Nucleic acid binder design. Sequence first.
RNA 1: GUUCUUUGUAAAGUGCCUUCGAAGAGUCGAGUUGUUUGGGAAUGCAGCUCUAAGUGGGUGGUAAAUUCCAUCUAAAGCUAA
RNA 2: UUGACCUCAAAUCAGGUAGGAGUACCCGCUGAACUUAAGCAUAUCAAUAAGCGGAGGAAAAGAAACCAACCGGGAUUGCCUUAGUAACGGCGAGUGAAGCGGCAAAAGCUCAAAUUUGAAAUCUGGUACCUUCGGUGCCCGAGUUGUAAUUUGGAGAGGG
Lengths: 99, 193, 203, 204
Amino acid sequence: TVKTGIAIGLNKGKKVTSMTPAPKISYKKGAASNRTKFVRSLVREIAGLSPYERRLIDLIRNSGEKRARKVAKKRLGSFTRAKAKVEEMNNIIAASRRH
Amino acid sequence: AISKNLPILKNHFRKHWQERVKVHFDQAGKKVSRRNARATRAAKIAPRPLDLLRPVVRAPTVKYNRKVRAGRGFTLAEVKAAGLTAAYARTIGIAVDHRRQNRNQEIFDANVQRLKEYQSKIIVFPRNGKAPEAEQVLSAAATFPIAQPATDVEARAVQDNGESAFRTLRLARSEKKFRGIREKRAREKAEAE
Amino acid sequence: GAYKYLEELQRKKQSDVLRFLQRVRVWEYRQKNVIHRAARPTRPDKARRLGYKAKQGFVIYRVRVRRGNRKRPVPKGATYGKPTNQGVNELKYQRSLRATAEERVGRRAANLRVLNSYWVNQDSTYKYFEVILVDPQHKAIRRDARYNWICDPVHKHREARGLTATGKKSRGINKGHKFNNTKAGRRKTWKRQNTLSLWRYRK
Amino acid sequence: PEYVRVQRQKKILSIRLKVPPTIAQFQYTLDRNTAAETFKLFNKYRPETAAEKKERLTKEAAAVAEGKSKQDASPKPYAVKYGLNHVVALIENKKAKLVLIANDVDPIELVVFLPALCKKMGVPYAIVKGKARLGTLVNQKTSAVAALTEVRAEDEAALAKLVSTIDANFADKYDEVKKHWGGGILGNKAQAKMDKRAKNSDSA
RNA sequence: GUUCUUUGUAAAGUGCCUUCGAAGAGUCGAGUUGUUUGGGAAUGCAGCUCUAAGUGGGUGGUAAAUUCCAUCUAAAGCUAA
RNA sequence: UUGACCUCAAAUCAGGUAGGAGUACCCGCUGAACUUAAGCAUAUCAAUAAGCGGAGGAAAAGAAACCAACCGGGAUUGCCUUAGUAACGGCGAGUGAAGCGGCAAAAGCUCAAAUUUGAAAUCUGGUACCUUCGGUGCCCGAGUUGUAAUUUGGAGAGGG
């Protein structure tokens, strides 16, 4: 990052020599796996899309993604966590049955 | 209730302070049981101090970033810079604060110096039993004092660059201020259609 | 692995065999009895990783729990006081209903020490749970500091106190500014933050 | 009494109700022919236990601490195999050379990943009826999670024979019961009498 | 401290390259309610409804959207002073 | 025909444990009023009285889904401190902090997540005997719905 030396500004501190840490796996907490993705994909086969999944996938193929964005919005609550749920189904749509 | 000029005082005594009270009449007493544990600890502990190895780590804020502070344990980055492992370094007499890390090399130095003077002074005996006793030094932390990482010098020559330093702050602050709105005009002349 | 197949499985309780367990164990409950004893784990992925071990000195307590609230005891529509309190059926229950179950099987056989309960079936009239029991009497757990700590009389009626999952949860005691009001034991910090303690040479 | 009450409605109340594609594939169990030879052939595959574990310490007493035998002494185990997590992870890496899926297991939940596995990891299986009869020739209890990644060159003959029989009469009829919703079989009451209703109000 | 005995094809630590590194859900937060409460457009806690995920997710004390980051790993556990 | 099989249970139950006491102090739930506002519901009283559930000398807390914005810091606990302030409150009466600094005292760790399978190999009990808080010859069961044994994030695991 580096500072400027000035007591304020973009960086209100000292340009003192930085350094690097070790591989703290507590910055690696967001991990997947060949054992988990095997299961997470084997899941959509052992059970696949449930009642809520059928419901919302038809909401995109209804009036758009903005409409299906306020459906998963009424299921999780995080407008941003919802945008995640949106592209995940287009992965069920395009990636699975589209080609 | 209110009569004649006096300060408006907020004295939280509407409840039963006269029930959940504790005047430290145990001041000098619990203070003495303190020094007692010291000597009772020792008899047991054999030749190891009332405290273990604590580092020199600078303090946070705009108020305490001025001087260092008696750190907690010891990172494993500073642990292998000394030459040993934590499951074995703690079984010696050095603290290990693994949840914390070092982001400065200037201080990492003053802290790696504390690991050399301390280890070269630890007469350690195995599972022999004879253990050639070499007494012990009271407090471990009061034996390796605040080596306040380089306070620099206190007598140099005159240097003037004519920036005023006062406007280097009137503008240093104007830097972080109009950053977003000066990028608003810089957003127009950023994209070329 | 195998158990993690069910770890991700014990997550999508919405269709086929999972939604089918809604129309199967709901009746399994309203069949045996209400507060009873079971045999082997119903969801090995949870129990185990949460504290279950398939060895002697091991039993399970599957229990039926009622939902809703806790309407203020006071007979009829009388509360004897100022409106700030008044309300009756519209009253919370600071402890989770989950504790209700533990505190029941827990004190049906206090010879045991409650480890932790696990959710498995919610309805309308009820919200069901199950229990993993550690026995401080069989040499099967009384020969393993892997979980030996349980048998000590300092663990007397685990569930009815707050040393379980729902416990530290139903105590408000967790690390962080999210709990500054009570990052210490409720009345410890309370008595503390109000207590007027004075010195020898009062400063 | 109450123990016959709850257990009878348990599986028979599960039959009026429409069983998911995860189930229903049941009743579509092992034919009476497979049971006959899968009992006469699996009677030559029995794992270590009892006198077998004892006879092992006497043979290494004349080998390991005798003519210095490094880990190897007696012939490697050639019988039937077992293990939930053992035969579960076996199919996940093709290691299995025979699959026998758990018929019962009160909690059919920890055996839900057995079927969809052989799917995107092709391995011939047959949902065999006998979690107990399985425990008898494996000298265990009620697990039904059996494996067989090898055998002898005197019995591997009848192996490939039923290898294709189970595969076709089970593994290939599986890609079919994929869009199959079973169950819904009523009794004589709402059935034979349900005939008097629709037969005396429609085309009669 | 001394004496009678190898548990030993014994057991474990830092080194090198590499393939890896799973990491806990009727949780999480959202919704509304009432209490609590410095926590003020939720301080937690509980309620019935909803019920995910992994460059993700809790937090950054003013709602909300986009941009990363800083920051840490819940949903499991023992522990003297 | 014979024998398994899971659940249920059965019994002056082989054979084991549970209640309660005390109850300054603590860990939950619980729950106000009087009082104060010069009257008064919101508030306050007070998440206190009483109420009911449970231990132990301390039990609870306890290694971070913490604090921070800095060169950062660094388990919990309790202590001067912050400060009766920023702040909550007919923003009326009054309520009410934390992180820093200083501080005694200070400490670390364990289970599931893997395929060891060339090996159910482990743990309860009974039983001759013994150096008896247990042990080995003899004999069952829980457990294969993971006890052994590998595995805990700051890491660290199969191959070589």
